[PDB]
Amino acid sequence: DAPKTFSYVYAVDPSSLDYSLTSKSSTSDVIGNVVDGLLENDKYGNLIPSLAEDWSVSKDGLTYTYKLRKGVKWYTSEGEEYAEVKAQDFVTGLKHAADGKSDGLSLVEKSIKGLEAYVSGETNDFSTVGVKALDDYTVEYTLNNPESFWNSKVTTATMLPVNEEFLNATGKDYGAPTPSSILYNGPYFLKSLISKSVIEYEKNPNYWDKENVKIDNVKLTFYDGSDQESLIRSFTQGAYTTARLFPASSNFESTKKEYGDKIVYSPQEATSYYLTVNVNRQSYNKTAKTDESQKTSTKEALLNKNFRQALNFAFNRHAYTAQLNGEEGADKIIRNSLVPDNYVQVAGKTFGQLAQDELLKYGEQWKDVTLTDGKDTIYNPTKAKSAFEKAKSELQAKGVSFPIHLDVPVEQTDVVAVQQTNSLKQSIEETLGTENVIIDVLQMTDNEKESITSQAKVPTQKDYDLNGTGWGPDYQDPATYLNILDAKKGSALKHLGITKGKDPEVVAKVGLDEYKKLLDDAASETSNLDKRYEKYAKAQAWVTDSSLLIPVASSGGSPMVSRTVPFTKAYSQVGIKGDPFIFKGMELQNDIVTTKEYDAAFKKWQKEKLESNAQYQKDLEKHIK
Amino acid sequence: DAPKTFSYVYAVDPSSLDYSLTSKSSTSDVIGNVVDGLLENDKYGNLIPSLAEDWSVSKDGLTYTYKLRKGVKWYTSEGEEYAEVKAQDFVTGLKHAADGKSDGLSLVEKSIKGLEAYVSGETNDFSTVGVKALDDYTVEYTLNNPESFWNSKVTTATMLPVNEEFLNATGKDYGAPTPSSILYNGPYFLKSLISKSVIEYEKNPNYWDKENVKIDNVKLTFYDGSDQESLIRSFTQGAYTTARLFPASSNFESTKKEYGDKIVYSPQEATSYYLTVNVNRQSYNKTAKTDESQKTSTKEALLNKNFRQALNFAFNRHAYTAQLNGEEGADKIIRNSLVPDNYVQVAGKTFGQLAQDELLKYGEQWKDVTLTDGKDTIYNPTKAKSAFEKAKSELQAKGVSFPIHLDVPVEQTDVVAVQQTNSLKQSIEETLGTENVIIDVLQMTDNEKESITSQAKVPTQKDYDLNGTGWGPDYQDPATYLNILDAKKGSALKHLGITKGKDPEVVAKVGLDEYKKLLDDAASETSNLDKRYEKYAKAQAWVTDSSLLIPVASSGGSPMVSRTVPFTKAYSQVGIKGDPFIFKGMELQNDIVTTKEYDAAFKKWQKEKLESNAQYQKDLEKHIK
Structure with a gap:
């Protein structure tokens, strides 16, 4: 009552x-x-x-x-x-x-x-x-x-x-x-x-x-006034309706953690989620297009790099990940790369730091784009309109008809996925204008969404223009991510409608042959970690620029409460010895970890992990004999 | 353990x-x-x-x-x-x-x-x-x-x-x-x-x-996975060490307020605290100065407006109020004016809005200075150094010797007041340089601090260069604040070393005679609220520029926890019908009010109070007969 x-x-x-x-x-x-x-x-x-x-x-x-x-x-x-x-x-x-x-x-x-x-x-x-x-x-x-x-x-x-x-x-x-x-x-x-x-x-x-x-x-x-703490004590027992706190007392900080925020979002993890642009679709059993003039104009539009970049810059990631996580957790899962920023490092510089340095070669539109975790650095309506006008003129000289229709399937019974895809249609159409691009959200059952995406192994059965998927690592090297776009063996080519051994036509159009040379030059470095990671960072820059794998989010970032002492547990992103259920090294405490204590521990851990991995890498020399 | x-x-x-x-x-x-x-x-x-x-x-x-x-x-x-x-x-x-x-x-x-x-x-x-x-x-x-x-x-x-x-x-x-x-x-x-x-x-x-x-x-x-809420339920009973939360569930928001921050800082109130510059000191029983050359150079320095403005711009309010309230509560009590921003209003414009519009006449140094509550807008080391160099040349042409020594007494047994005054000495000396200004903090007993400040009624007994004090209102008009500097009856003149009927010499030097004309022109408006409050805003601008009453903080801003429904209680800043212990209109609830709910209620109340007072003022016309 x-x-x-x-x-x-x-x-x-x-x-x-x-x-x-x-x-x-x-x-x-x-x-x-x-x-x-x-x-x-x-x-x-x-x-x-x-x-x-x-x-x-x-x-x-x-x-x-x-x-x-x-x-x-x-x-x-x-x-x-x-x-x-x-x-x-x-x-x-x-x-x-x-x-x-x-x-x-x-x-x-x-x-x-x-x-x-x-x-x-x-x-x-x-x-x-x-x-x-x-x-x-x-x-x-x-x-x-x-x-x-x-x-x-x-x-x-x-x-x-x-x-x-x-x-x-x-x-x-x-x-x-x-x-x-x-x-x-x-x-x-x-x-x-x-x-x-x-x-x-x-x-x-x-x-x-x-x-x-x-x-x-x-x-x-x-x-x-003899006991300043009688008030917060009586309030906690339920005897007082209110209680003044005194910031100068020796006990204020303990009072602060008892009545302070305790929800924390786990750090982002190594699985990367992205949207796959179907640049070679030949299955239209689930489309909103009516004409062949619309299928043709869409196929040519998706092969245009400026058009894929316009889609990329127009996509509001915060609004998309506000539907799955919290509004307070929306930025906690955003990733702007394929390889995580700190997945490897050379001389104290993270892989994302290396990849960003190779990115501005591809144009001024990549100014201020950091390939980092935590904040959407790609979404830019000004850049998206500038990219689309360049695409508009190139396509209009090829008989392309506007608006471009883009089919995006989603499982109707998945409420969050529906809300997320509707936000994708919203942000892109708001930025580019509906006379230019229309995101056709096709809601359907679990199985037909699954039948045209994840269990449509044959690329010729991939029935979409955009679809969300993810990829996680298997070994501590950027190649575990960057090899998925390899022209001859890359597992992610089927999501773009490209078969592993065919389509030199389509591979050359989207530039995956230039990417293939970047992969092999990086793979050739078997010993020099500096040259190796520099060359794979060049590959990541190509992926970012290609906009074939429009980045969305990472794993992790889930809200939680805990009495576990954070960042004492063994940590790893490949192998089994640092997995979530590894208990060696983990410590427990009696009080709930507050959000402020967890965030201060995370920033200190981030600082120490950087120094520790760098000292470790220097010490790899002593293991040569 | x-x-x-x-x-x-x-x-x-x-x-x-x-x-x-x-x-x-x-x-x-x-x-x-x-x-x-x-x-x-x-x-x-x-x-x-x-x-x-x-x-x-x-x-x-x-x-x-x-x-x-x-x-x-x-x-x-x-x-x-x-x-x-x-x-x-x-x-x-x-x-x-x-x-x-x-x-x-x-x-x-x-x-x-x-x-x-x-x-x-x-x-x-x-x-x-x-x-x-x-x-x-x-x-x-x-x-x-x-x-x-x-x-x-x-x-x-x-x-x-x-x-x-x-x-x-x-x-x-x-x-x-x-x-x-x-x-x-x-x-x-x-x-x-x-x-x-x-x-x-x-x-x-x-x-x-x-x-x-x-x-x-x-x-x-x-x-x-049949019951997503079994985890946070088991964690709350103490059965689980940790608990994943699911932001999409129908119950996430309730979980958020149970484990979210609940400490709130009450809104700032009508008492204004400031530092009084003694521009007419003739009692030196408690000073660190040794020469008369130091007493003379200090007396001339404090009469210089550029020197008082340099002190004003050099004073870090956040660091001073971080010692009394929290570091999270430091901005919650800062005030940059004498009359509160929203103490009165005309046509939806607050008094601070009116006073700010009259402030830039006094010079470019008042650019971006808002006479508001909540954030230090005065502290500016760049402006403080620019103001001091102007004061340096004026004084150096008058045989003034640097550094200028400034006595500031404080009760030794008051830990917070000591820490606050030490921070005042710190911020000013860091900004202006110790070869220019030295803040001499004189720690002493409760009574001698009191004997040379608050119970030193006679102005000739005021033994300091700077001292903190406050003033609260007695009626709903800016004059209740602005009359304290009245040249003939103002109660705050004794804190500046000025007696109510004498010292036309000193009154003219600091410009309190020009302020007196501003007070009377404003007081003459007995009916027109627009002209009245405009003219008092001119007086407040003079106070801000004079830097005789260097603003520090307000009352209120105290941290608390409560089950009271906020902003249902009757509200007033003068009279007794809206005082803190007024219970008519106040509502209670069963759950602790969270910080987010309190801050959303405060912003909505702020928006409604503005509209309500403005509609009320328009409706004062119907009560004429």
């Missing part, structure tokens, strides 16, 4: 309940809950009607008139009806503040006409002061000067109403620090006021605005 | 424990914990010694030789010593993989010399294959070609050792999915393997590297 009791603390006892005579907040903090004035504040600070249901100010700004609500009663400490709140109770309160030498008078002493002369003593009768009860329900204030901020003063303790009969009947005991010494017309009764112990309010069931009083009981235990 | 049991899940049963014959990960995930090979991985991925205590490769890269550790034993399922691990066990394992038609052979089939011919069947004797036991503790591999990634292959299941006696003795039952079907030499014993139920490992107490095995017991309950 919803709680109706509020429990917290207070720090200063009220020495007096006479709100007319003192405005120290140790009194007002009680009185503001139990005694109402002319106006209130809403949740936005606006001065809204309280005991005055309406108010007006004269044209000259000197006269303020308040129309009171009629059915409002004063109530005793015991809850018994005393009398009806009348306009004269506002003359009484202000007259009591003057006669009683109140400390809260300087806000209105020189504003209310004739009041300053009455407090100084040069008049002895209150009739001259600019507060009048024109009738039982009309309070009128007259000021010396116009005050645009006057209404902000009517919510002070000095300006509250006081019943004259009760004031004189109780006499010297009026305003004593006990609940029986004042009368109540506000949202709450003061049920208990025990010095250096407790303050208790209970909702007044006859309050005129009882429906806005949503907390029925309020209890404030006395807090001396 | 530290837990020694790991509890989680597994999803695929091992169909076989014969690691030589299959490399499916449903087998390797078990075997990697219980059977060791030549090399391991450390926590960084490096291939480190395992059963081979050292290894070498020939100059041509074709021959790899591994020196085994001697005291390693094979152990039964029961924990009984079987035999000592010898080099021949690596010939046996690879020969078993060939004879048994293993699926994990394609990694090394064409690398190990003569192996491919043996698996194809054109040789029938294993003596031709490039794996040899040169003695009981020397394994030698011969490759067809050099492979810089070869060692990454020796941690695969296919490459693990196998005892020949046990292999032939157990026969057809070898590798069955039961723990008695293999032998153990790795970190763990396989204690239980019940299909679709449990996998249990126990630490092997005789393991050669037992000190790196820090988890004693591992239990993996079978997880079928």
Whole structure:
């Protein structure tokens, strides 16, 4: 349901309940809950009607008139009806503040006409002061000067109403620090006021605005400041509704990890996911195209490198991976390469660092593109439109018809895959415009999607224009990734519609023959790791530029909570000795690992892993004999 | 202490424990914990010694030789010593993989010399294959070609050792999915393997590297994927050490708030804290200056506006408020003005918006300075050095001697105040250089700090050059702040060493007479709120430029946790009806408010409060009669 009791603390006892005579907040903090004035504040600070249901100010700004609500009663400490709140109770309160030498008078002493002369003593009768009860329900204030901020003063303790009969009947005991010494017309009764112990309010069931009083009981235990941690301790046990924390105390950091974020996203792993562009499709059993003019224009468009690059630059990876992971986890799985950035290294430089240095040769469009993990560096609508206009003119000189239709199958029963593909259609069509490119998302069963993609071994059966797939490593060398596009044995050629031994026509068109020379020149380096990894980085740059394997994401990046000490476990990306279920070296702890501790441990591990692998590689020389 | 049991899940049963014959990960995930090979991985991925205590490769890269550790034993399922691990066990394992038609052979089939011919069947004797036991503790591999990634292959299941006696003795039952079907030499014993139920490992107490095995017991309950939420549920009950979360499930968001950050910093409040520059000091009972030449040069320096602006631009507020609040709470209390940004508004434009528009008249140094809350916009070391060089030349033409010494008292027993003042000395001296300015932090008792600042009513007793103090509002008008510098009645003049009715000399030097004309012109507007608040914004711009009241911070910004529904409570900055202990309108809830929910509620409240106050101000017209 919803709680109706509020429990917290207070720090200063009220020495007096006479709100007319003192405005120290140790009194007002009680009185503001139990005694109402002319106006209130809403949740936005606006001065809204309280005991005055309406108010007006004269044209000259000197006269303020308040129309009171009629059915409002004063109530005793015991809850018994005393009398009806009348306009004269506002003359009484202000007259009591003057006669009683109140400390809260300087806000209105020189504003209310004739009041300053009455407090100084040069008049002895209150009739001259600019507060009048024109009738039982009309309070009128007259000021010396116009005050645009006057209404902000009517919510002070000095300006509250006081019943004259009760004031004189109780006499010297009026305003004593006990609940029986004042009368109540506000949202709450003061049920208990025990010095250096407790303050208790209970909702007044006859309050005129009882429906806005949503907390029925309020209890404030006395807090001396001797134990700053009693509050967060009581809150954790459920005794307090709220708890102030103190950043300077010796215990703040422990409090921070107990109530801080604990969800962490595992580091990205070695499997790389990408989209395969079918540049040699001869199966159209599942297409949205109608003409052969559309099939032809699509086939020529996909063979154009500028057109594949325009698709690449137009694809919003964050929106695509926000559908599978979180919005907070969307960047945690993005990969802009095929070989992971740090899969190997030479002289402290990661493979992605090497591959990026070879990438700008292919054109200015690769400026600022880093072949890294964690953030989409490829998506660029400006670059995508610039790439497409170049493709548009090349194709338009070949009788190509626009828009280009692109079939992308997806399993209808896979909600995330549908949402992801719909986002792919969205980002590309938004960037390139639907008069240019149309992504035809074809939803279908598990098996027909599978029958035209993953179990369509024969390339001539691959029935799509774009499809998502992945690849993971088998040995600690870039070739385990980069060999999948090998013109004669590459396993990824069937996903592009290319058979391993045929199609020299298509292989030459997409440039896979130039890639083949890059593969063999890199493979020839059997000993020199520097030359070897430099030459494979040239191959990765070709893949990035080719846009045949439009990168999407990696494995890993899954959210989790854990009491495992992170980055103590043995680590590997090939073999079995660093797999996820390897427990040698792993440490456990009693407390949940917080997100901040995990991210600080990850950055330190990243820094140490770089140094360790580099020192290890230098030490490979000592194992020669 | 530290837990020694790991509890989680597994999803695929091992169909076989014969690691030589299959490399499916449903087998390797078990075997990697219980059977060791030549090399391991450390926590960084490096291939480190395992059963081979050292290894070498020939100059041509074709021959790899591994020196085994001697005291390693094979152990039964029961924990009984079987035999000592010898080099021949690596010939046996690879020969078993060939004879048994293993699926994990394609990694090394064409690398190990003569192996491919043996698996194809054109040789029938294993003596031709490039794996040899040169003695009981020397394994030698011969490759067809050099492979810089070869060692990454020796941690695969296919490459693990196998005892020949046990292999032939157990026969057809070898590798069955039961723990008695293999032998153990790795970190763990396989204690239980019940299909679709449990996998249990126990630490092997005789393991050669037992000190790196820090988890004693591992239990993996079978997880079928039928209930994705069983994992986070079991983790919350303490049954699992870790738990994967699934961002697509209907329950992820609830999981996120249960394990997400819950600490929130209350919004900044109306009290403004600032540093008062003593421009008229005639009490030197607590100073670090020695000469009169230093007192004179300091007195003239503080009267220079460029010098006060250089101090202002040089003061790092984030570092100062990182000592009182958190490092995560440091910006949560910063204020760059005297009047709060949104204290009043005209036509949807906040007072800080008005004041900023009047600020750039005073010079280019106020470019990009916003008079807002939340982020230090004043601190600028470039602007501080540019301001000081202008001050340097003006003062150097008046016989002023550098560095300028500035006394700043602080209560020694107040740790935070000491740390804060030391950071003030740090940031200013780092920016301006210690040959130019020196901030002399004078630590002292509670009372002497109090005796020369807050209870030194007479201005001639103010014994400092800079001191921190604050001021809060009494009515909803900018004048409640801006009147404190009034030349004849302003309460803040004594903090600058200026008496309310005297010192026309000093008042004219710092320009407080020009400020006085700004105050009266603004005060003259009794009705037009637009002209009134525009003219007070001109006064605030003068204060910002004067740098007599160098702004520091606000009240509020305190960290807390709460079950209160935020921004339902009545709100006010003057009066008593919106004070912190006002409970009318406040709502409670059962769950702890998370930081994300509180910050989304704050931004929405900020947006609504702006619209509500503006609609309210337009509606003030209907109350005229």
